Amino acid sequence: GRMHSAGKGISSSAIPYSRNAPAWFKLSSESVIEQIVKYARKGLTPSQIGVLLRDAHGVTQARVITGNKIMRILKSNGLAPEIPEDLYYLIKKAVSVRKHLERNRKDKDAKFRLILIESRIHRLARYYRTVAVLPPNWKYESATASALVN
Amino acid sequence: GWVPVTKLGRLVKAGKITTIEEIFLHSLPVKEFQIIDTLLPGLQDEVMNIKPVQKQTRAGQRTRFKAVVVVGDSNGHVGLGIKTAKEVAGAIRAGIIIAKLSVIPIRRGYWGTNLGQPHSLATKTTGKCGSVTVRLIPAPRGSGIVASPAVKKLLQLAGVEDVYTQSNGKTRTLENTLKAAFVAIGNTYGFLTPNLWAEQPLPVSPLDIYSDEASAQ
């Protein structure tokens, strides 16, 4: 089930059992790599890059066509963000909910939800700092993290 | 003189059916107790318990007699009889009738290696009837039927010689224990062994073959 909830949904994707080369695609293998480079130069997060690729140009996903995932292409060209996508979005969520809680001092639901979001951030950040993506301390604080995200 | 009233009654009356394994294998049902008497003789009887039971009406108090008895000759064929009648001897007769009507067999075995006319079971088996559980464990040669004397008498009439019996549950009652032990030895016969993995000829229910001389008059 969910990590912090009682729900047990299973909505997801399902990659096809075909590891090669969609037949009608027949376009290129590197040209899509410079649209990766171009979109990353624009500043989009890798999930956004994947969804715009499969909505616009017929790329199913980059792992099957290019032979590489999106992040290793972005890191290869050196456009990789400092902290990854998901931790950054979690920090942004925590920041916004703390500003609202700062304005509205009686909202117990936001206090509970913020404790949940903080614990989720802590689990993910501990995973990252034990796999050598963050510096081995990285000290997630409650206030200065605002300047970390925006 | 007994007159057949059913299909297997006509089957056994003329003596065309003699081997009891044809009855057991296809599970031929029986509703009259005379079939086993005309088929298997010598079935020694012994009484478990006869007790008065009271049914209370608006004004009266009817007293009946519940009789439980057992039947088994000496060799792997057992029957238990629960009846309730209006008279003690009639209750014994009805109980032994239903006990001879519900005879089940027993597949015996050796505790360890195979040698010389099996004496015990072939599998540790459970039997449950209302918070009593009889667990039957095979035992070595000449180890004695280590059970309660009623249950020891039950397996002594059965045909086995040495069975360890760890029984768990409130054993102050008798009827629950005897029903649980009956189900235990029944499922002991029902517990499959790989020795029966050989190809079996699969008969076509030989009442079909003998349908010319077992039908209606």
């Binding site: - | 360890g112 290696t113 040698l115 010389g116 070595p140 040669r141 000449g142 180890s143 004397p149």
Partner: protein, 131 residues
């Protein structure tokens, strides 16, 4: 500061003391062989229990085990030398199948009655005691 002489007890009291089948069989044996009390039946039962325990944990050991070979051969040779098993029953499933009468048959009073010379087992025993 001297060693102990080791000691044990050859008899064993039964678990359920009061069982009419057990009391009847004990008294039947006592009449049939002329014993003094129930300690003799208990002692033969203890000897038989030891022998059957040895036989059980020898048979649970695999076939052709050298320990099984040596200890089983010694046990069977011993129990045919005393003459409880027969001559042609030199296998362990038979020594699982031993009875107490098969041991009391090989005593002294039973032999000095069975060989004549006494005409009664009680007379046999009192003729033993009188040297």
């Amino acid at each position: 500061p001297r060693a102990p002489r080791t000691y044990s007890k050859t008899y064993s009291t039964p678990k359920r003391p009061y069982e009419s089948s057990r009391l009847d069989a004990e008294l039947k044996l006592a009449g049939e062989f002329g014993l003094k009390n129930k300690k003799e039946i208990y002692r033969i039962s203890f000897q038989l229990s030891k022998i059957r325990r040895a036989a059980r944990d020898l048979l649970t050991r695999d076939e052709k085990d050298p320990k099984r070979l040596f200890e089983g051969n010694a046990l069977i040779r011993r129990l045919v030398r005393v003459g409880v098993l027969s001559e042609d029953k030199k296998k362990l499933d038979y020594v699982l199948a031993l009875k107490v009468e098969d041991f009391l048959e090989r005593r002294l009073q039973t032999q000095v009655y069975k060989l004549g010379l006494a005409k009664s087992v009680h007379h046999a025993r009192v003729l033993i005691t009188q040297r």
